[PDB]
Amino acid sequence: IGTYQEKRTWFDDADDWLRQDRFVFVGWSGLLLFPCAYFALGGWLTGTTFVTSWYTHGLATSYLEGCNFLTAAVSTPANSMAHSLLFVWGPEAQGDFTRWCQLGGLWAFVALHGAFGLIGFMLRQFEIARSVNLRPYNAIAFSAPIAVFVSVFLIYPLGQSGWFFAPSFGVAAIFRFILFFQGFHNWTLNPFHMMGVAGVLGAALLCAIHGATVENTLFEDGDGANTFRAFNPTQAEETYSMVTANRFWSQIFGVAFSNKRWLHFFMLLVPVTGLWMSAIGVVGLALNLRAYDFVSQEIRAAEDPEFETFYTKNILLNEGIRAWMAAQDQPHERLVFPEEVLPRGNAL
Amino acid sequence: EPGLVTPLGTLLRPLNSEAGKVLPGWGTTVLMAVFILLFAAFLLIILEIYNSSLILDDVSMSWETLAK
Amino acid sequence: MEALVYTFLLVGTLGIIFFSIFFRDPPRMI
Amino acid sequence: MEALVYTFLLVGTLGIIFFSIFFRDPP
Amino acid sequence: RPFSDILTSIRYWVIHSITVPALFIAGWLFVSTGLAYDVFGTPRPNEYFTEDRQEAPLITDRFNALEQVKKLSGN
Amino acid sequence: IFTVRWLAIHGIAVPTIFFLGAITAMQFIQR
Amino acid sequence: VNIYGLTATALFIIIPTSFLLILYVKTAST
Amino acid sequence: NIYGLTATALFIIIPTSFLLILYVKTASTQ
Amino acid sequence: GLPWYRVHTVVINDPGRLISVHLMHTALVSGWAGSMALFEISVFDPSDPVLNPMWRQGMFVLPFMTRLGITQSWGGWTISGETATNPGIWSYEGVAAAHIILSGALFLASVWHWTYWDLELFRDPRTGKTALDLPKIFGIHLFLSGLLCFGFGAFHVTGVFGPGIWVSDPYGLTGRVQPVAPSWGADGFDPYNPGGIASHHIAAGILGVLAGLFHLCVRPSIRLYFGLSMGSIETVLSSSIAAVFWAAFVVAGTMWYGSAATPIELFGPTRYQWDQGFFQQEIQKRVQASLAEGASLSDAWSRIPEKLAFYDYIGNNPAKGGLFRTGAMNSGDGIAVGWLGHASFKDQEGRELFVRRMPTFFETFPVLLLDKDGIVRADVPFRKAESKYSIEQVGVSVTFYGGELDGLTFTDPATVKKYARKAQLGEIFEFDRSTLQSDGVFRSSPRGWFTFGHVCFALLFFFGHIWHGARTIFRDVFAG
Amino acid sequence: AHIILSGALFLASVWHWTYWDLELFRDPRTGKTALDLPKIFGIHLFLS
Amino acid sequence: RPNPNKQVVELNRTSLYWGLLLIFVLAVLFSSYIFN
Amino acid sequence: ARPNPNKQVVELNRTSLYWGLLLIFVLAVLFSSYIFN
Numbered sequence A: 001i002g003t004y005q006e007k008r009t010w011f012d013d014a015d016d017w018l019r020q021d022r023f024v025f026v027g028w029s030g031l032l033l034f035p036c037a038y039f040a041l042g043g044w045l046t047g048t049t050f051v052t053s054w055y056t057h058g059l060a061t062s063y064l065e066g067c068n069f070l071t072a073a074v075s076t077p078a079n080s081m082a083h084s085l086l087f088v089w090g091p092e093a094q095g096d097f098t099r100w101c102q103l104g105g106l107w108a109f110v111a112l113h114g115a116f117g118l119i120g121f122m123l124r125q126f127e128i129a130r131s132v133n134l135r136p137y138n139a140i141a142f143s144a145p146i147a148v149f150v151s152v153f154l155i156y157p158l159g160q161s162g163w164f165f166a167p168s169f170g171v172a173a174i175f176r177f178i179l180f181f182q183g184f185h186n187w188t189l190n191p192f193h194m195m196g197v198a199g200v201l202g203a204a205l206l207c208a209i210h211g212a213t214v215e216n217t218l219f220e221d222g223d224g225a226n227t228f229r230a231f232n233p234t235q236a237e238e239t240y241s242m243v244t245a246n247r248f249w250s251q252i253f254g255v256a257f258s259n260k261r262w263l264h265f266f267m268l269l270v271p272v273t274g275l276w277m278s279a280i281g282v283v284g285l286a287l288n289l290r291a292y293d294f295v296s297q298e299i300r301a302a303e304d305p306e307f308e309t310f311y312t313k314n315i316l317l318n319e320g321i322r323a324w325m326a327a328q329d330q331p332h333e334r335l336v337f338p339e340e341v342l343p344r345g346n347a348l
Numbered sequence B: 001e002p003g004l005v006t007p008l009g010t011l012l013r014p015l016n017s018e019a020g021k022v023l024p025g026w027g028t029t030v031l032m033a034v035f036i037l038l039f040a041a042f043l044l045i046i047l048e049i050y051n052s053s054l055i056l057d058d059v060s061m062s063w064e065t066l067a068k
Numbered sequence C: 001m002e003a004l005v006y007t008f009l010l011v012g013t014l015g016i017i018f019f020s021i022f023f024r025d026p027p028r029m030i
Numbered sequence D: 001m002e003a004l005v006y007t008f009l010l011v012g013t014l015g016i017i018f019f020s021i022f023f024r025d026p027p
Numbered sequence E: 001r002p003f004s005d006i007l008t009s010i011r012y013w014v015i016h017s018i019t020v021p022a023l024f025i026a027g028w029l030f031v032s033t034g035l036a037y038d039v040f041g042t043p044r045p046n047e048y049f050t051e052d053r054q055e056a057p058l059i060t061d062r063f064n065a066l067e068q069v070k071k072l073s074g075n
Numbered sequence F: 001i002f003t004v005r006w007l008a009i010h011g012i013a014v015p016t017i018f019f020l021g022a023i024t025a026m027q028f029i030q031r
Numbered sequence G: 001v002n003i004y005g006l007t008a009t010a011l012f013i014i015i016p017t018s019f020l021l022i023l024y025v026k027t028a029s030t
Numbered sequence H: 001n002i003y004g005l006t007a008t009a010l011f012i013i014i015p016t017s018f019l020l021i022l023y024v025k026t027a028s029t030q
Numbered sequence I: 001g002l003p004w005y006r007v008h009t010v011v012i013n014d015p016g017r018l019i020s021v022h023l024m025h026t027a028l029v030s031g032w033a034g035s036m037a038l039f040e041i042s043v044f045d046p047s048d049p050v051l052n053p054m055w056r057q058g059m060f061v062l063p064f065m066t067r068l069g070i071t072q073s074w075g076g077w078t079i080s081g082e083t084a085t086n087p088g089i090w091s092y093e094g095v096a097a098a099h100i101i102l103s104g105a106l107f108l109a110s111v112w113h114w115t116y117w118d119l120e121l122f123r124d125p126r127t128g129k130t131a132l133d134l135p136k137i138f139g140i141h142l143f144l145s146g147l148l149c150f151g152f153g154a155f156h157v158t159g160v161f162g163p164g165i166w167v168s169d170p171y172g173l174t175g176r177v178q179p180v181a182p183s184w185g186a187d188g189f190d191p192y193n194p195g196g197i198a199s200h201h202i203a204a205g206i207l208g209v210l211a212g213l214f215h216l217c218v219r220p221s222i223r224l225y226f227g228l229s230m231g232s233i234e235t236v237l238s239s240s241i242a243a244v245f246w247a248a249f250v251v252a253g254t255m256w257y258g259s260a261a262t263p264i265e266l267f268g269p270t271r272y273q274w275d276q277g278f279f280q281q282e283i284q285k286r287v288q289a290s291l292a293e294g295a296s297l298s299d300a301w302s303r304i305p306e307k308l309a310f311y312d313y314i315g316n317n318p319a320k321g322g323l324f325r326t327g328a329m330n331s332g333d334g335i336a337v338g339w340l341g342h343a344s345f346k347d348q349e350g351r352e353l354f355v356r357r358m359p360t361f362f363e364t365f366p367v368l369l370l371d372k373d374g375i376v377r378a379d380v381p382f383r384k385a386e387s388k389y390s391i392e393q394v395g396v397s398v399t400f401y402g403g404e405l406d407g408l409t410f411t412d413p414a415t416v417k418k419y420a421r422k423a424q425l426g427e428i429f430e431f432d433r434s435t436l437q438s439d440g441v442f443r444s445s446p447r448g449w450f451t452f453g454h455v456c457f458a459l460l461f462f463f464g465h466i467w468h469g470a471r472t473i474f475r476d477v478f479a480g
Numbered sequence J: 001a002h003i004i005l006s007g008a009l010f011l012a013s014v015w016h017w018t019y020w021d022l023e024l025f026r027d028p029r030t031g032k033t034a035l036d037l038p039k040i041f042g043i044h045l046f047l048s
Numbered sequence K: 001r002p003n004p005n006k007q008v009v010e011l012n013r014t015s016l017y018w019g020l021l022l023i024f025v026l027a028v029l030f031s032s033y034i035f036n
Numbered sequence L: 001a002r003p004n005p006n007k008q009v010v011e012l013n014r015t016s017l018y019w020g021l022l023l024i025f026v027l028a029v030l031f032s033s034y035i036f037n
């Protein structure tokens, strides 16, 4: 059936069945995407619904214990496990299930199955693009979320002392992670995070302007005020005036797009670059390579007691966060800070 | 038009000559799959030993292995 | 010294912005 | 690092000479 | 079989009216009988602080955590 | 009957209703 | 104030600028 | 050394960039 | 024509310029290796090998040369501080000169191959077009790689013909270049077992030779040939990028977590040795053994080598530096000079007190003096706060055993406070932050820099693999 | 003051570069560009 | 022998402006950290 | 304001480029030792 018109085998029949068009496109990558993603979602839900974190973190995080949607999470394993893969059949759990769920292995289960689900999803995007005969720019775009997930949930915990310092799958847990980076890593001051936030805000800006400009430069292709109905999806004529939009934005802003392909490629390119740079910054953080302090200003402040800048105030705030949060954030250190050593504004 | 001729090129011609030839059918794909499965099992063994998730009596999995 | 470098960088960026706004390639066949 | 920059300048001059010798434009 | 025909058929309604409440009561009993507290190891609202520790548990060693978690839980 | 659509819909629905019942039951346990 | 920082900044400003000017002049001449 | 190193770097770079720009302009038109 | 990001695509359709360009890149790499070797040899200070080792002075390529046998230098000094009896041809300067000469030869070969691109070797006699039989090229190159791997494993690492690799004791006190006997048992898969390297290289060389012979003889299947686009040069690029970023991830992991291929004498101690108090436990074990044998505290603490105490210091932790804290470790906190001896803090009642050591996370950590039980007995009252457990209020005294200050006992509250602050960081050492005008903030060892660079490169090469594989699979739509 | 003068002169130079085909530089008889060098010299010497 | 695979690189004024802006913005962002 | 008749383009052949590069590098070699003092 191929180039040389040869016979058909098991692989041919499997390929014909898998790629058959239906409501739910399975594809070859479906065998990987569907079970992994299904078990990731199931693990997250059954963990945030029944499983607790009393023994791993000393916290109560579940619906059964009385937490709502915002303060429920699947917490990471205890710091004692370090970087253990923590299989249900592993030496830690010895095959037991209730101990395994009680020991924090459900986080590792969810994270690993979700990562493989992401891989399967990108493979599915590739398969769909090949089937429809289109350039697979969607997979190139989706590369950035995978990079962010790998940097934050896998590479960073591996660089640290264990899975304990990974983000936990929950809203309040993510907020804790964010504040932890602020207090300890000075993550706001890292230039890579600056480039990432610039990219994300620029992507939102581009989306807003493109939508408004397209919707405010339509051609009068029909009667009535409801312009949405005046559009035929099979038409071969442009639905908005590129020349008018170009002139308007060149006279308002100063520079305006003149190529549709370049415009949409720029929309694709900005956020992908932003999150890739954020991922590189997080990779740098994983090894404690922090853009924490400016040596010149620190020396000047130490020498001159009258020297104050917003940078020094941020340093003081970070020190306060660290000292007041590490007491309960990291139980395995067994830190007991006397009330007289905690940093505190003396004014009271 | 003919290309440049060198004694080394004449010697090495047969290596690059048989270009594009294929073996009809599926060939040895099953053997390749078996070897891939074996390599995946071996890599899993290595990763688990190194991760301490697979403890063997002989191995120590620490710097004290250098004391043996 | 470093303040002069920062000022030069900012002035150069502003000059590039001005040149891009004004001395632009005229767009044809939009 | 003065010796380094001296050597770099001399090697650059030698490279310019070599390129002029071997990569001259045809008449 | 379009979704309109799926909804219209009475066989689906009669076969689902005997199963949906069954699943709902199964979940309600799962919570109420206390099987959830046992299968998942979630402490009951009276055994959070046992007299032995009176504090939050802290797992120490990974290899022997199997016995440590149960001795900390009071089991 | 046992098509892939049936499998997907039921696999997503049955645990959903079971967990909804579980949450409704948990809403009433006294603290 | 270190020489390394100033020279790195100067090189990073100048070399890509020269490369871009080369390419733009090549394009405009053609 | 900062003065001398900066002067040498600029003298090496800027005139070479100018000459390269002129040559690339010339070579474009065969 | 082409945009600025496609200028190198002109080489895709002819092998000769591909050979020339690859030769140019290899020449550039060799030249960088030689130049960096020369620079590091120029900057290195071999005066003190126990307190100023290579990893303390920001050496990058020097440990890699030292790992495989090169130890002596033409300047009359060895890496161990001993005099060089006979440097020989294979010295650091010799290696750098060899790399430079190789770079020049490769540059000349690249120029020649660029000049003569039209060669009859690349043209298939059947159609007279430039074509490369990628499976057979892969077979030949795999055969060569397997042969080289087997040779390196059997003759160099084993020491049958070559010098051998670097082997050290677990605590990194006495490490030298020694031949290793390959271990074929289970312990051969222990990463900290040096014989595993030789066993791996021998076995992998044999298997690579066999696989090269197979791929040289057997032709690919038609289904596989068309499925993986074996007739296109771009698929090889995608597969190679995948392989290299996998290799980079593995290498970075091994470097960060430590292995037999990254001795701590060359790359410094790791993060997890300080996290788990490795050297601290060893020092305590030695001290307890000496005390049980019967000896005074000064005698017990004077038998601890200064090297072992130096390894037990937060300053040597790779995870304490900063992204833009450039330079060697010496440029931050100065150069180590000597050991001040172990410091013991005791209150007025005579109760023994210990300082809570600083965890790796905390840039700044409060100092706490706590008893054996764990209850805090003293602390510094922040900056300008009033306390009931201040150092002078409790009357804490410090006694030094061993080191430079052996036998001394300070009671001045300022002195006790300063020594407690300096001892919360681990063992107390003397530094001279004047020769290099050190800032006083910690830097990162070459281990951390190598790990950071290679993880970033692997992460970027992942996207490279994605893009090039997408281009290969979708060649028809991309071309037209 | 010197810096501001330099900026003003830069702007004037840009303007004079943009507009060059002035009737002032055209000979009334021939209609081609010309300069009556002795008279410009006289004016400039008077000003000096 | 002349190479059939001959092509010329082009860079319009917009690309030049983008590149200059990118390099100057990167220098502005990273100068504070490089100088420290 | 119209197309200026005085329009001309500058050229610089490869020989001139080599001469200029050699002059610059030779001057730098000669004066670097003096400038570093």
Ligand code: CLA
Binding pocket: I026, I027, I029, I030, I032, I033, I034, I037, I060, I061, I062, I063, I064, I065, I068, I070, I095, I099, I102, I142, I145, I146, I149, I204, I205, I207, I208, I209, I247
């Ligand atoms: C025979 C020539 C030769 C020799 C003896 C050396 C020797 C050396 N080089 Mg040099 N080098 C050479 C050629 C040579 N080099 C060339 C041609 C280049 C240009 C590419 C370089 C570029 C270079 C650099 C940039 C550096 C060195 C360095 C070194 C030193 C450390 C080597 C090391 O750790 O390798 C370790 C090698 C590896 C870990 C490579 C692993 C290979 C992977 C695993 C193969 C995977 C693919 C494989 C084919 C899969 C199949 C496997 C199996 C089935 C067959 C050592 C003195 C280093 C140094 O300190 O010196 C300054 C250094 O930084 N070299």
Ligand code: CLA
Binding pocket: G008, G009, G012, I040, I043, I057, I058, I059, I060, I323, I324, I325, I326, I327, I328, I445, I446, I449, I450, I451, I453, I454, K026, K027, K030, K031, K034
């Ligand atoms: C894998 C690559 C690698 C690694 C791990 C190292 C590691 C090391 N090198 Mg080596 N080096 C390398 C490649 C590498 N080098 C190469 C390719 C060169 C040639 C340029 C050098 C040249 C070199 C010199 C000359 C010196 C070192 C030194 C060092 C040490 C200190 C590193 C440091 O200060 O970080 C600095 C880290 C950074 C500045 C982070 C930069 C990362 C971001 C992404 C840069 C982005 C810049 C961007 C374009 C914007 C620019 C803005 C503009 C104003 C500049 C360390 C052992 C020093 C040392 O002590 O050794 C004796 C030293 O003197 N290296």
Ligand code: CLA
Binding pocket: I004, I005, I006, I007, I008, I009, I237, I241, I460, I461, I462, I463, I464, I465, I467, I468
């Ligand atoms: C084995 C490595 C390898 C090889 C051989 C290639 C080869 C190629 N790539 Mg791929 N690529 C790679 C890795 C590789 N790439 C990786 C890792 C990435 C992810 C970052 C990409 C992303 C990528 C894209 C997105 C595109 C290519 C394209 C191309 C083609 C033209 C490249 C060109 O002209 O750039 C010329 C580049 C310049 C003139 C300027 C580049 C300047 C950057 C900043 C690098 C500066 C030098 C750098 C600092 C040196 C250090 C390198 C580091 C690895 C040590 C060519 C076939 C293009 C293509 O095929 O188009 C049809 C294309 O669109 N590549």
Ligand SMILES: C=Cc1c(C)c2cc3nc(c4c5[nH]c(cc6nc(cc1[nH]2)C(C)=C6CC)c(C)c5C(=O)[C@@H]4C(=O)OC)[C@@H](CCC(=O)OC/C=C(\C)CCC[C@H](C)CCC[C@H](C)CCCC(C)C)[C@@H]3C
Binding pocket: A037, A040, A041, A044, A110, A111, A113, A114, A115, A116, A117, A118, A121, A138, A141, A142, A144, A145, A149, A168, A169, A170, A171, A174, A271, A272, A275
């Ligand atoms: C928080 C932000 C955020 C979310 C939630 C999100 C979500 C999504 N984006 C998708 C697509 C995309 N996102 C893209 C670009 C981006 N996406 C971004 C940010 C996000 N994208 C950003 C910033 C960019 C810019 C680069 C692209 C280009 C695409 C797509 O093509 C794709 C799409 O088609 O969208 C509709 C979908 C992929 C579905 C999937 O993997 O199914 C498979 C399911 C899997 C793998 C299970 C997930 C497992 C996860 C990783 C772990 C478990 C997580 C828990 C279940 C939930 C945790 C709850 C929290 C409170 C912690 C999904 C709707």
Ligand SMILES: CC(C)=CCC/C(C)=C/CC/C(C)=C/CC/C(C)=C/CC/C(C)=C/CC/C(C)=C/CC/C(C)=C/CC/C(C)=C/CC/C(C)=C/CC1=CC(=O)C(C)=C(C)C1=O
Binding pocket: A194, A195, A196, A198, A199, A202, A203, A205, A206, A209, A210, A211, A213, A214, A242, A245, A246, A249, A250, A253, A255, A256, A257, A258, A263, A269, A270, A273, A274, A277, C010, K025, K026, K028, K029
């Ligand atoms: C003395 C002085 C000046 C003191 C000030 C000092 C000071 C604080 C300086 C700030 C320093 C500074 C610049 C810091 C920023 C540094 C920083 C974070 C750099 C980011 C660098 C970087 C590489 C980021 C990576 C991510 C990235 C690529 C971001 C790009 C973001 C970006 C440019 C977004 C686009 C924004 C934008 C305005 C788009 C408008 C587009 C537009 C005009 C569309 C119009 C339009 C729409 C249509 O729909 C149609 C149809 C047509 C036709 C049309 O035209």
Ligand SMILES: CCCCCCCCCCCCCCCC(=O)OC[C@H](COP(=O)(O)OC[C@@H](O)CO)OC(=O)CCCCCCCCCCCCCCC
Binding pocket: A252, A253, A254, A255, A256, A257, A258, A259, A262, C010, C013, C014, C017, C020, C021, C027, K012, K014, K015, K017, K018, K021
């Ligand atoms: C009253 C308003 C006064 C003006 C307000 C400010 C206007 C500033 C406009 C700057 C545009 C620069 C574009 C250069 C490059 C250029 O000429 O672009 C030209 C480009 C149009 O390109 P074309 O569509 O013609 O391209 C056709 C293709 O075939 C080739 O590109 O315009 C854009 O891409 C829009 C995106 C602008 C994004 C601007 C971001 C803001 C500037 C960056 C941040 C500056 C910080 C300064 C800190 C000191």
Ligand SMILES: CC1=C(/C=C/C(C)=C/C=C/C(C)=C/C=C/C=C(C)/C=C/C=C(C)/C=C/C2=C(C)CCCC2(C)C)C(C)(C)CCC1
Binding pocket: B032, B033, B035, B036, B038, B039, B041, B042, I186
């Ligand atoms: C195919 C292919 C490939 C690959 C190749 C390879 C590389 C292979 C290899 C393979 C291998 C290399 C395998 C191995 C395996 C091994 C094993 C599988 C082992 C096992 C063991 C055991 C089982 C043991 C057990 C035990 C112990 C532990 C001791 C005591 C006794 C007992 C028995 C208990 C690639 C991807 C590249 C590409 C494509 C093609």
Ligand SMILES: CC1=C(/C=C/C(C)=C/C=C/C(C)=C/C=C/C=C(C)/C=C/C=C(C)/C=C/C2=C(C)CCCC2(C)C)C(C)(C)CCC1
Binding pocket: J003, J004, J006, J007, J008, J010
């Ligand atoms: C090297 C040398 C030389 C030369 C030198 C020179 C020639 C220099 C020049 C220099 C220069 C020539 C400089 C200039 C500068 C300028 C400037 C710096 C300007 C500025 C301006 C401004 C800033 C303005 C602004 C403005 C305007 C525009 C108007 C309005 C107002 C404002 C303010 C806005 C020689 C050979 C003799 C030898 C010796 C050495």
Ligand SMILES: CC1=C(/C=C/C(C)=C\C=C\C(C)=C\C=C\C=C(C)\C=C\C=C(C)\C=C\C2=C(C)CCCC2(C)C)C(C)(C)CCC1
Binding pocket: D011, I028, I029, I031, I032, I035, I100, I101, I102, I103, I104, I105, I107
């Ligand atoms: C050849 C030869 C010669 C000579 C030599 C000499 C005398 C010199 C050389 C010199 C040199 C001097 C060389 C060098 C090379 C270098 C390189 C090749 C570099 C590279 C670099 C890079 C690639 C970097 C990159 C980067 C940056 C920029 C920063 C950081 C980051 C990154 C990594 C991105 C003769 C003819 C006599 C003989 C034969 C041999």
Ligand SMILES: CC1=C(\C=C/C(C)=C/C=C/C(C)=C/C=C/C=C(C)/C=C/C=C(C)/C=C/C2=C(C)CCCC2(C)C)C(C)(C)CCC1
Binding pocket: A039, A041, A042, A043, A045, A046, F015, F016, F019, F020
């Ligand atoms: C883990 C796992 C398991 C088990 C089980 C499973 C797989 C499960 C799943 C499960 C699931 C998968 C579940 C689900 C659930 C869901 C839910 C529970 C939902 C809910 C929802 C809601 C509640 C909503 C709400 C709302 C909205 C949003 C709208 C409107 C408004 C409102 C608010 C109403 C086993 C061990 C056997 C194996 C492995 C895996």
